[PDB]
Design a protein around this ligand. Structure first.
Ligand SMILES: [Zn+2]
Length: 263
DNA sequence: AGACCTGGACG
DNA sequence: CGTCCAGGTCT
C-alpha cells in the first residue's frame, strides 16, 4: 500500500475504532513487533488505553491512544479489519487488539512483512521509522525547491529518487511510474540531469496523481486502476500516442513507461 | 542482491 | 513442476 491506499484505510478505519478501550493484545507473529522489541511489553503497555485517533504519515498508520502512539507499516500485504470476538479468525491474522466491547481490531499480513512500533506520543515523530521521513506530498512543505535540492545532489535515477521516503513520503512503484509518465520524463534519467522546468512539471504531476488517487480510494475498493497510463500495461498501446508501453528494470525494480511520451 | 515471506499467473 | 512476478524497506 502507498499513500492513497493507506489514507483510505485511515478514513474508513477511524470511525470503527475511535473511543474503544483495549482490553487485550494478542500476538501470533512477534517479528512484526519492532518496538518494544519484547512483544510482551508491547502487549502490556497498551492494555487499558483508548483509541483517540488515527493519522497517516507517509505510508504509515499512526494510532493515537492515551499516552502512546502505535506506528503501523503494512508493507506489501498488511490489512486491518474490525470484527466480533465471537467469530473465528481469518487466516494469516498475526496481531489482534481486543476491545472491551467485544469487538477486535485484526491485523492480517500473508507475507509477514509489516511492522509495529509503540512509543510515547511525544517520542513517535523523533524516533524510527517516522523521524527520517520527507515532507507530505500534499503539503506546502513539498515544493519544487525541495525536490530540486535533493535531485542536484545525486547521480541516481529519478525513479530511485522518488521512491526514497526521506525525499518525500508516500510514493511507490505504481504512482512513481504514473507521475513520471504524466510529466513526460523517462524513469531512468539521472536525477541531476533534470532541468528546472522538468522539476516543476514533475512536482505538479506528483501532487496531482497522488491527489486523484486519494479521491478515488486508491488502486486495487479503489478505482484509480482505470486511470493508469503505464503501470502494468506493458505491451499495450499508450493511451495518448498508441506506442506500446515498455517494461524494463530501473534501480532493480520493474519499471513501466512510454518511450515516446517520456523523454 | 538478497533479505524477510507466502502465494498466484505462467507454461 | 519450476520460475517468475508482486503496490516495501532494509542490508
Ligand atoms: Zn505515449
Amino acid at each position: 500500500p502507498q499513500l492513497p491506499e493507506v489514507e483510505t484505510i485511515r478514513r474508513t478505519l477511524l470511525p470503527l475504532i475511535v473511543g474503544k478501550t483495549i482490553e487485550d493484545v494478542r500476538i501470533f507473529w512477534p517479528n512484526i513487533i519492532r518496538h518494544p522489541r519484547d512483544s510482551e511489553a508491547f502487549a502490556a503497555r497498551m492494555i487499558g488505553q483508548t483509541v483517540r485517533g488515527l493519522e497517516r504519515r507517509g505510508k504509515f498508520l499512526k494510532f493515537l491512544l492515551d499516552r502512546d502512539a502505535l506506528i503501523s507499516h503494512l508493507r506489501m500485504e498488511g490489512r486491518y479489519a474490525v470484527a466480533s470476538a465471537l467469530e473465528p479468525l481469518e487466516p494469516h491474522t498475526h496481531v489482534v487488539f481486543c476491545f472491551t466491547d467485544g469487538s477486535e481490531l485484526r491485523y492480517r499480513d500473508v507475507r509477514k512483512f509489516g511492522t509495529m512500533h509503540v512509543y510515547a506520543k511525544e517520542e513517535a515523530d523523533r524516533r524510527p521509522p517516522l523521524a527520517e521521513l520527507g515532507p507530505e506530498p500534499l503539503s506546502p512543505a513539498f515544493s519544487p525547491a525541495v525536490l530540486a535540492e535533493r535531485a542536484v545532489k545525486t547521480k541516481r535515477s529519478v525513479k530511485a529518487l522518488l521512491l526514497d521516503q526521506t525525499v518525500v513520503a508516500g510514493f511507490g512503484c505504481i504512482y512513481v511510474d504514473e507521475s513520471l509518465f504524466r510529466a513526460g520524463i523517462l524513469p531512468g534519467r539521472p536525477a541531476a540531469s533534470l532541468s528546472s522546468k522538468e522539476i516543476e512539471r514533475l512536482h505538479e504531476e506528483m501532487v496531482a496523481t497522488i491527489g486523484e488517487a486519494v479521491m478515488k480510494g486508491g488502486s486495487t475498493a479503489g478505482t484509480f486502476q482505470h486511470h493508469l497510463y503505464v503501470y502494468g500495461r506493458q505491451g499495450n498501446p499508450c493511451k495518448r500516442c498508441g506506442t506500446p508501453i515498455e517494461k524494463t528494470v530501473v534501480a532493480g525494480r520493474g519499471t513501466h513507461y512510454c518511450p515516446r511520451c517520456q523523454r
